[model samples]
Target: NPNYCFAGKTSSISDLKEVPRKNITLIRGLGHGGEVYEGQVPLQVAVKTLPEVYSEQDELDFLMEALIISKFNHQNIVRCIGVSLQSLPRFILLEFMAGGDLKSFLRETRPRPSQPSSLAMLDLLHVARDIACGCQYLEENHFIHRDIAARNCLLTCPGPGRVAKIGDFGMARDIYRGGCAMLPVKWMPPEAFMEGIFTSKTDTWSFGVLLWEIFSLGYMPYPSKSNQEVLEFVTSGGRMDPPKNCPGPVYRIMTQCWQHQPEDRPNFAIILERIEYCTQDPDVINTALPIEY
Candidate 1:
């Protein structure tokens, strides 16, 4: 069992009133379960506070995950700076990205019915490579990023060139030696979705969707469909296609990731190689396009 820490013991803020009023500005209500605050330092820090509704078990789980994430120190992965269990409302402090999340950045850059520019593609590839590196590190450590998506990926800027960092480990879990169970339905691989089995292959499937999200900016994973509808469609052999502006080779790689057979999906190392190939080849990357997405 994971160790449990009371609200007044291990948290960064000892008191709720001292939630960093000056250097850090608190942003109320973010996501589904926490409050966000901006840090006033060069490191770009953000503090997230969990509500009082969380049980001791929930706090324990979060602390365990935080411990795992803190063990990893990578440029592409958000850095965990501190944890505050001393306050009535506990919270975690993390590296902040000035550009916000990839989804929001995409929305601001291209809006709807538009695609990312060539510069955006290059920057995205770089960011994607960083994320792949982070994932590679995680897998090597016997962990899996169960939920990989654009919304979870945060960017540092929205421009011709920008950097991205993967955030949110709320659902991440370690893959023990024996094996693990399937992931969520919408982002799961065909085999995982149908048979309730998960593996590194399933992670690759999620990576493919992330690739699409990066290329298409903020386009819905499944256009004009609800979450349940998207799950049904994907489970029933439907695959998302890359946007028109997305390069042919990139599209092919995304398709390969979504292959019906789990083993058919390429590993993160191989995926990195392919991304390198596409990026190095000027003919393939299309640098002439604008830098919107």
Candidate 2:
């Protein structure tokens, strides 16, 4: 497996390729001050670059992220093609996801009153289950991903063969002692934003917000609330209600994820089991508002 990016030692830098600059073509700017580009190592691929003005700590954390991603081999996790680490402003080459990120996809396919979206409840469940599986893997691996929103999930293609894959390991860290400063305020749990504490349970909290994103068709969590207000709200035990027409079982999972104590929240494995149970029960899967297109 040394030939593939999915398996390698970070110290054995020779296992990864130092992709040349000429082969990369920047397509657009993205969050985290990175650029997404089209790369051709003969076949087209996606390349994400580190920030141009990265510091020593930034470079180390960037490598750490790459190393963490390189070790994963899950279908629900984004595939790392390789990296361009020999030079400054390193690049993480990844498989091109034609359908783009899940946030825009959800908004674009959202349903309106008396109008149905192209996606059905079952499809959304599949997306949720896929992400749960990804987080389950992370939890089992002892990794804590601080960013786990729909924006960080990617789709391989739209419709039939579409598969949701977890992306963006920028804020991810091993559970031991490597915590970062930056945080996704809305997606974070009470302990994370307030005490700088993060664990797999925190990811469960974020997963619930992701469920909101999926069911709400990409509505921002804590809609209309400022970051400070959201902090105050969550600190006061305020949680967002389920989106209209969301299935009871799904909303139940969301509520469980928002439990006050991190230990009270269901882990991703439990969430996955609940989602599977939902898929099996016709009442749970088909009870939501019907999608027209």
Candidate 3:
């Protein structure tokens, strides 16, 4: 059974606005889940309302997660402006990211005919660095963001470079006070999968997978493998192959993250240091080498 009661009104982005809108201006579609809208203010905002069929427990969980995320005040993390429970279904109001999620952006820039031009290696590196910084903040605060996939990380700008803002805390937990044991298998480290244990180290492992996705332009990790196949592969000592375009140092970092033993994975602090080195090292970040697979 659900834990919270929906008041009765179907809430939308318009309803959350302090002022009323005469016409609807759709900013963007949030896949199959929700919608984004332009507000009267200069800032565009995203409003995610729970589907009516979602149980009360789902609503309560989302509310708790949102409340926690609202307390996070880092520039690299998207700001949760306000939440509206005035209506029947609650809605989460967040700052609209101009560039959307990293996965879609990467897919749009693939080498295929229909895809947009690929992002410059330096730009991609910068985004990775920014994401790592955000993750570092969460780790420092004793929080573990279990879902560290590219789809959950957003880009806020549309220009010479994109600014990354980590979002979606629904799967985040407080590690300082003994976080939950839920694990997303696809992104889990070996120890996490075996023991159902999570830590900042596991989060770093997920971040490495995200890095692989970013460098590969959105290719699925271990493409074409079934759940069992992936499970066996990891359990029997398998690792994600570095994308052909990924830099040698960065690939090495990913390899470290995929280490069979959890203790072997680099922590966020180490990951941040490596990213900084790569970003600051002009020879690596701006190399003219072709990145096309």
lDDT of 3 by residue, 6-64 (tens): 22222333323332233223455566553344432254677666666788656666566
TM-score of 1: 0.80
Look at candidate 2 and tell me the lDDT of residue 58. 60
Better of 2 and 3 by lDDT: 2
Q: What is the TM-score of candidate 2?
A: 0.84
lDDT of 2 by residue, 6-105 (tens): 2232343455566776676666544434667766666667877778776766665665666667778899998877888766668888888887899999
What TM-score, computed on C-alpha atoms, does each candidate reach? Answer: 0.80, 0.84, 0.82
The lDDT per prediction is 0.68, 0.79, 0.71
Which pairs clash in model 2? none
Ordered by TM-score, highest first, the candidates read 2, 3, 1
Where does candidate 2 have its weakest 10-residue lDDT segment?
A: 1-10
Question: Highest TM-score, which number?
Answer: 2
Worst 10 residues of 1 by lDDT: 11-20
Top candidate (lDDT) = 2
